[PDB]
Design a protein around this ligand. Structure first.
Ligand SMILES: [Mg+2]
Ligand SMILES: [Mg+2]
Ligand SMILES: [Mg+2]
Ligand SMILES: [Mg+2]
Ligand SMILES: [Mg+2]
Lengths: 97, 100, 250, 87, 129, 95, 287
């Protein structure tokens, strides 16, 4: 019977955390800081998807050409096979054409 | 410091007295408040006196003295809903409690 | 004397400017020190709550990057050869022990890799979103304008008592013009508070104007915002980015 | 709270160290130097004499000009010849 | 090599503006292009229509589905229902029927079915916007 | 066709399509008639006059050719002395 | 507005009240339940359900439509054909009336770009602007335009009103520096010299009939006189009025910008112009 018998511990959430209180600040650093930075230069993450959005085949292609030279061996290998699979899927399979 | 407001009965003469003291002619209810010093002095005297201030959301709405006159004679009454329901002359079979 | 900040930018001929009290933080019971009027195309635009929803969801989601990844049936370990032959056994035909039907197999359509949710709204919609947030805060009677954020003392309890006396709200967003020239007293007072937050005028956004109940500008920040937001109206389409030099821009 | 200070650009040229191996090759050519001069003026950038061609680059330019970009006299002359032969 | 001179004036003619200029004052109107400024004072109608960035009166054509021809009056500030009554009173001799419209009170647009762009631009120049 | 290339992740045009057809900016594809230069000795001059024509394409042929090319090919082109330039904008349709 | 006055009476706008404009968000359809998924929209089991329908254009085995048809060179040399964005005189009168193009100065291509009258893109091989005769009647402007092609009737409409037209040439490189000059002066390169036309276009720009910039200034009064006779206007002499010194200025060939010279390095930062004084560079730049 996959249901729990006692109700779980309560989820104490601090809405006035440092992160929550200061979320969203400097999203308008462009439009009211004389366009010296874009907001996309505010985001932190992988180097191949800072200010870039793609589907999965494009994320894999971009990751391979941007960081693929210093990827580990079997990660590089898995990623080559994922591009090869996702190529054969987006280009040859589906409903609409 | 409570947001309850009850407009005075001598409000016409008080307000007119303030309009003369910031200035003065007849038809004084149609004086434009286009001058910003005149508006600040008039509403600052009234806020100092009556303890009731024209809010920022309405402050541009009075362009004549008549509009300030029409502002300072709405009763802004402030109390809790427990004190509004229990004072609304309940029948003898309503009972309201406030677990607060 | 009063403090009467008349509007510096040219108003349209058919709208009169909207006024607001100027207060101070020096006096514990000293509001209404002057009366600033404000540009109607930034503090009295149309209500437009749909644009608030656009800009709020933009601010939430553009910086977002999900790190959730799972393993597909190729990436999970082992499972290279057929477990049993195709036909002879009475069991189901299987090709690996790592197909998504097996306990321990790959995930068929799980989350793949870091995904970025990046998109830009046009800058005229972000700018219009800031305007709409300002008119809404002013219309709901939550805008308060100071002449400076200079407190008589640096205690937090002073500022919470001041905000309680003037019936502000649970959370106040204080906005000064620059980060360098913020007075030391408001820095010491708000650096300890959870709900009263100092932000430079550059840092002003829409998520944190809606998050906070009241919003507190200074008069230099008001002139700043009128300048930076009335600029987006009446400007050409760009030849090249505005970070590059122009005839008249900085 | 107080907001952490607003993110700004670097107030002047970024000169990467050439001996480093993770400096990409576009940041240590002469075009990067000319571009940094253009952004930051004479004060922060480079010696201004580097912007024009060296005499080796000058004779390469001159060779290319003589090869692919003829003069009006030779253009007009080839047009007289082609009009003549066509007519 | 180098010989630095301030003849930089010729560079300042190459810098584009950012703010679109106020149109210059002409002697008579309308201008040879047919442009004509909004009149001062603003008329005492219940409604008002702005101009665009480019000082043109904002009536736009709009097609959808390849056959929905329609026209949009866009920067309408004030009472859009008076504007819908007056447009509907203006176009109905040019159609016989009342034109089928749609006000969008939120954005402040008014959307009429069929192209009437030149007639509404001329009409709104007459009204003084 | 290729919907996502392996290098760019973009769509690709089918270059047979470009090699045979002409996209007018209004959306009409022009083509040449099949067999217009074959066995002319056994065709009547009416038929030869019919084959030497620039024939428009069908609706579904048009949408099939749109899907097989990219947005580069769908673009305004202000050539110098273009023969087909008066046929780009569509005059005087009543839908 | 009555609407902000409505916002007084309503509770405060928060992150808990927000809602998209109805019509913005269509709902996602996903294959669960009795309607959206049992066969899940693929139909019966064939090749289109399995997912393996053949490529676009494949007609199942007969020779496809897009291959039964002969190759003809409609698009044969498409990316080497030159393009010229039209600028009608209706458009240019429109720009002059609204202050966007100042007719008391020479109208080069930079002034049509900075007024945002014409958007020209040097990739996609636009070679510049061509004047267009649309709006020739009702064109009332004394102007000095430098436009890479011009029809006779557009030259007539400008030169009637006391104007000057000339047709210059620009390389893709040169045109690219002309349109957006400020991202060139951040590139650090010296100003190059614009190249002369190719052999196809030298007979264009050396004819006085279409006002070439390489043509005689001794054959121009004959051509101005001929158009003035053809289209029935008395040819005004530009020499008399006060704008004449403005209406005479041309930049010579091998000069991209107006007051500047090739080989100069514009220092945008401290507002200087660095000029070379080496003799080999001066032979190369003043060629
Ligand atoms: Mg395997
Ligand atoms: Mg298998
Ligand atoms: Mg697993
Ligand atoms: Mg697993
Ligand atoms: Mg449309």
């Amino acid at each position: 019977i996959g249901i729990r018998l006692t109700l779980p511990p309560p989820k104490v959430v601090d809405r006035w955390n440092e992160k929550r209180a200061m979320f969203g600040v400097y999203d308008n650093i462009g439009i009211l800081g004389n366009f010296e930075k874009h907001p996309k230069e505010l985001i932190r993450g992988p180097i191949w998807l800072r200010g870039w959005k793609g589907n999965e085949l494009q994320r894999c292609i971009r990751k391979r050409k941007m960081v693929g030279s210093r990827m580990f061996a079997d990660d590089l290998h898995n990623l080559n096979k994922r591009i090869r699979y996702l190529y054969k899927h987006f280009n040859r399979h589906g409903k609409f054409r | 410091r409570s947001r309850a407001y009850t407009p005075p009965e001598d409000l016409q003469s008080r307000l007119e007295s303030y309009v003369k003291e910031v200035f003065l002619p007849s038809n004084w209810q149609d004086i434009s408040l286009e001058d910003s010093r005149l508006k600040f002095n008039l509403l600052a005297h009234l806020a100092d006196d009556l303890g009731h201030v024209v809010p920022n959301s309405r402050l541009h709405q009075m362009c004549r003295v008549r509009d300030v006159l029409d502002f300072y004679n709405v009763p802004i009454q402030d109390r809790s809903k427990f004190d509004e329901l229990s004072a609304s002359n309940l029948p003898p079979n309503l009972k309201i409690t406030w677990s607060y | 004397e009063p403090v009467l900040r008349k509007v510096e930018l040219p108003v349209p001929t058919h709208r009169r400017p909207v006024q607001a009290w100027v207060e101070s933080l020096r006096g514990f019971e000293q509001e209404r020190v002057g009366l600033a009027d404000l540009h109607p195309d930034v503090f009295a635009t149309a209500p437009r709550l749909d644009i608030l929803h656009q800009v709020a969801m933009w601010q939430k989601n553009f910086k977002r990057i999900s790190y959730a990844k799972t393993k597909t049936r190729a990436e999970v370990r082992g499972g290279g050869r057929k477990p049993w032959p195709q036909k002879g056994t009475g069991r189901a035909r299987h090709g690996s022990i790592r197909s998504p039907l097996w306990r321990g197999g790959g995930v068929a359509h799980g989350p793949r890799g870091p995904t970025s949710y990046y998109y830009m709204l046009p800058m005229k919609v972000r700018a219009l979103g800031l305007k709409v947030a300002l008119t809404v805060k002013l219309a709901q009677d939550d805008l308060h304008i100071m002449d400076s954020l200079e407190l008589p003392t640096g205690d937090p309890q002073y500022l919470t008592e001041l905000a309680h006396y003037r019936r502000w709200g649970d959370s106040v967003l204080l906005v000064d013009l620059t980060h360098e020239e913020m007075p030391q007293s408001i820095v010491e007072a708000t650096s300890r508070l959870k709900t009263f937050n100092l932000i430079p005028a550059v840092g002003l956004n829409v998520h944190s104007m809606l998050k906070h109940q009241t919003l507190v500008l200074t008069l230099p920040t008001v002139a700043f915002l009128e300048d930076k937001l009335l600029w987006q109206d009446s400007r050409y389409r760009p030849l090249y980015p505005f970070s590059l030099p122009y005839s008249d821009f900085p | 709270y107080r907001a952490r200070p607003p993110p700004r650009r670097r107030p002047g040229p970024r000169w990467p160290d050439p001996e480093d191996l993770l400096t990409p090759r576009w940041q240590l050519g002469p075009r990067y130097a000319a571009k940094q001069f253009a952004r930051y003026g004479a004060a922060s950038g480079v010696v201004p004499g580097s912007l024009w061609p060296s005499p080796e680059q000058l004779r390469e330019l001159e060779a290319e000009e003589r090869e692919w970009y003829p003069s009006l006299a030779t253009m007009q002359e080839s047009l007289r010849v082609k009009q003549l032969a066509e007519e | 090599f180098v010989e630095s001179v301030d003849e930089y004036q010729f560079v300042e003619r190459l810098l584009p503006a950012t703010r679109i200029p106020d149109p210059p004052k002409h002697e008579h109107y309308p201008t040879p292009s047919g442009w004509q400024p909004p009149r001062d004072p603003p008329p005492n109608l219940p409604y008002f229509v702005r101009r665009s960035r480019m000082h043109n009166i904002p009536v736009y054509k709009d097609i959808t589905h390849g056959n929905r021809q329609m026209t949009v009056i866009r920067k309408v500030e004030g009472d859009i229902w008076a504007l819908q009554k007056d447009v509907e009173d203006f176009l109905s001799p040019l159609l016989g029927k009342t034109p089928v419209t749609q006000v969008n009170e939120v954005t402040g647009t008014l959307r009429i079915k069929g192209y009437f762009d030149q007639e509404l631009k001329a009409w709104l120049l007459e009204k003084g916007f | 066709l290729t919907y996502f290339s392996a290098r760019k992740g973009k769509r690709k045009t089918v270059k047979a399509v470009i090699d045979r057809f002409l996209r007018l900016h209004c959306g009409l594809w022009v083509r040449r008639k099949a067999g217009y230069k074959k066995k002319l000795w056994k065709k009547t001059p009416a038929r030869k006059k019919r084959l030497r024509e620039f024939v428009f394409c069908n609706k579904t042929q048009s949408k099939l050719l749109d899907k097989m090319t990219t947005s580069f090919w769908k673009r305004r082109n202000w050539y110098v002395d273009d023969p087909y330039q008066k046929y780009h904008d569509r005059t005087n349709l009543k839908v | 507005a009555r609407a902000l006055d409505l916002l007084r009476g309503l509770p405060r706008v928060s992150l808990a009240n927000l809602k998209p404009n109805p019509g913005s968000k269509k709902p996602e359809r996903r294959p669960r339940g009795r309607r959206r998924g049992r066969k899940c929209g693929r139909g019966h089991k064939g090749e289109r359900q399995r997912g393996t329908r053949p490529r676009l254009g494949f007609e199942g085995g007969q020779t496809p439509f897009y291959i039964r048809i002969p190759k003809y060179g409609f698009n044969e040399g498409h990316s080497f054909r030159r393009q010229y964005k039209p600028l009608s005189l209706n458009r240019l009168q429109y720009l002059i009336d609204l202050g966007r193009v100042d007719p008391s100065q020479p109208i080069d291509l930079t002034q049509l770009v900075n007024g945002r009258g014409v958007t020209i893109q040097p990739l996609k091989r636009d070679y510049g602007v061509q004047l267009v005769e649309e709006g020739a009647d009702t064109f009332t402007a004394k102007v000095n335009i430098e436009v890479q092609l011009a029809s006779e009737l557009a030259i007539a409409a400008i030169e009637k009103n006391g104007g000057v037209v000339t047709t210059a040439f620009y390389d893709p490189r040169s045109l690219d520096i002309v349109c957006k000059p400020v991202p060139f002066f951040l590139r650090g390169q010296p100003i190059p010299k614009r190249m002369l036309p190719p052999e196809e276009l030298v007979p264009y720009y050396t004819d006085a009939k279409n006002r070439g910039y390489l043509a005689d200034p001794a054959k121009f009064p004959e051509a101005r006189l001929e158009l003035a006779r053809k289209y029935g206007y008395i040819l005004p002499d530009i020499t008399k009025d006060e704008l004449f010194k403005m209406l005479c200025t041309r930049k010579d060939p091998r000069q991209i910008f107006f007051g500047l010279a090739p080989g100069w390095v514009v220092n945008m930062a401290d507002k200087k112009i660095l000029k070379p004084t080496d003799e080999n560079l001066l032979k190369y730049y003043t060629s």
